[PDB]
Amino acid sequence: TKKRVALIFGGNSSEHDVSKRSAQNFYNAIEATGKYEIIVFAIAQNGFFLDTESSKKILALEDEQPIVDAFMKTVDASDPLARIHALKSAGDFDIFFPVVHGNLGEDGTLQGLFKLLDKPYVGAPLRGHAVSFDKALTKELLTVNGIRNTKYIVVDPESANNWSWDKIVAELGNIVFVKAANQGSSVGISRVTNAEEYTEALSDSFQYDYKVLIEEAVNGARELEVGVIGNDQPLVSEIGAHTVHFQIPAQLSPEVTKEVKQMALDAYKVLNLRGEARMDFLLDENNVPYLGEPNTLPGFTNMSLFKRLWDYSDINNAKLVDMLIDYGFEDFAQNKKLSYSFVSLGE
């Protein structure tokens, strides 16, 4: 109605399609408040930003490739800023609302661009996304801070050489997970139980990153996911447990519930997160909760957990997205007080 929101979706990842679905439910939520004007932008799998008109169609779920191909013919290959030129195609706006799942929205890249343009945005700062995205970086901060998670080892092409399977077993056990540090959703992940699987797991993971993480596996089969939103004073959702069949509120003992919610809160702060996040846990056979991977940009599709978690806290989609936008505006205001002055130099 006045304030303009730039809703960005898409991304050069394997989760390109899931992004479109999340973007739609966010759009409807922002629209349902009647306070802002939405301007949508899409990022094709080739990294290029698309104009508002082309992206409006892609959001509607129309065949994407023809739309992209047509756009690529209007691009000037001699412009070093061509990949982001389409961002001005619809004029000035007030705040970015990122919903790009994968290697652009969760690793901190887009957030760098947002700061350079001195414009507000929703979600965590670039540092927060960067630490939450890097598998190794996440475990190191959580461990030094006392938040329970599995035992692990970080290797590279050369160090991996000092780690025979027998040594890995002495440290982590006979059942481990090998994986590329920076990579998302799938590839580079392996379930190792013996020396044969380990040798080939390293070769595989070393194709997606030069830094591999090896961690022991939790025996228990009970996934827990909790949402957290806010800045200086975070809110924690109810717990969703596995009984894609999520049970809410999770049926755990009063003690396990408060412990899992506290870990989610403590983790959010040590990981330097802001705005929104989903904390995924693993509960073993003795009801001991282990914080797994943090999610800086959760899915908002019809079937994803974050789409209905806040309903159990009386926060509907409209209120939720409105809170996310207020937090974004607030943090920009706080960072505006910070000084970057200095005593002028000379000869």
Ligand X SMILES: C[C@@H](C[P@@](=O)(OP(=O)(O)O)[C@@H](C)N)C(=O)O
Ligand Y SMILES: Nc1ncnc2c1ncn2[C@@H]1O[C@H](COP(=O)(O)OP(=O)(O)O)[C@@H](O)[C@H]1O
Q: Which residue has the tokens 């040594």?
A: 167
Which candidate in 15, 64, 225, 276 is catalytic?
A: 15
Residues within window 179-238 making contact with its own copies, judged by CB under 8 A: 182, 185, 187, 207-211, 232-233
177 belongs to the binding site for ligand Y (CB under 6 A): yes
57 belongs to the binding site for its own copies (CB under 8 A): no
- CB-based contact 49:138 (threshold 8 Å): no
Please indicate whether residue 15 is annotated as part of the active site.
Answer: yes
225 annotated binding-site participant: no
Selection from ligand X, Mg ion, its own copies, none that 71 binds (CB < 5 to 8 A by kind) is none
* Residue of 101, 135, 179, 274 interacting with ligand X (CB under 6 A): 101
118 belongs to the binding site for its own copies (CB under 8 A): yes
Cα–Cα distance for residue pair 235/346, rounded to 1 Å:
50
113 belongs to the binding site for its own copies (CB under 8 A): yes
Which candidate in 159, 164, 185, 203 is catalytic?
A: 185
98 belongs to the binding site for Mg ion (CB under 5 A): no
Stretch that binds ligand Y, among 6-14, 51-59, 184-192, 259-267 (CB under 6 A): 184-192
Please indicate whether residue 203 is annotated as part of the active site.
Answer: no
Residues within window 104-163 making contact with ligand Y, judged by CB under 6 A: 150
Partners of 242 in the beta sheet?
Answer: 246
* Residue of 17, 171, 196, 200 interacting with its own copies (CB under 8 A): 17
Cα–Cα distance for residue pair 104/22, rounded to 1 Å:
16
Q: How far is the CB of 111 from ligand X (least distance, A)?
A: 17
Q: How far is the CB of 191 from ligand Y (least distance, A)?
A: 7
Listed residue (123, 100, 169) closest to 276, CA to CA? 123
Binding mask 274-313 for its own copies (x = CB under 8 A): ----------------------------------------
302 belongs to the binding site for ligand X (CB under 6 A): no
Residues making contact with Mg ion (CB under 5 A): 184, 280, 295
Residues making contact with ligand X (CB under 6 A): 15, 18, 101, 184-186, 280, 295, 298-299, 301, 304-306
Known binding-site residues for Mg(2+) equal 280, 293, 295
Residues making contact with ligand Y (CB under 6 A): 150, 177, 179, 183-186, 189, 215, 217-218, 223, 280, 282, 292-293
Catalytic (active-site) positions: 15, 185, 304
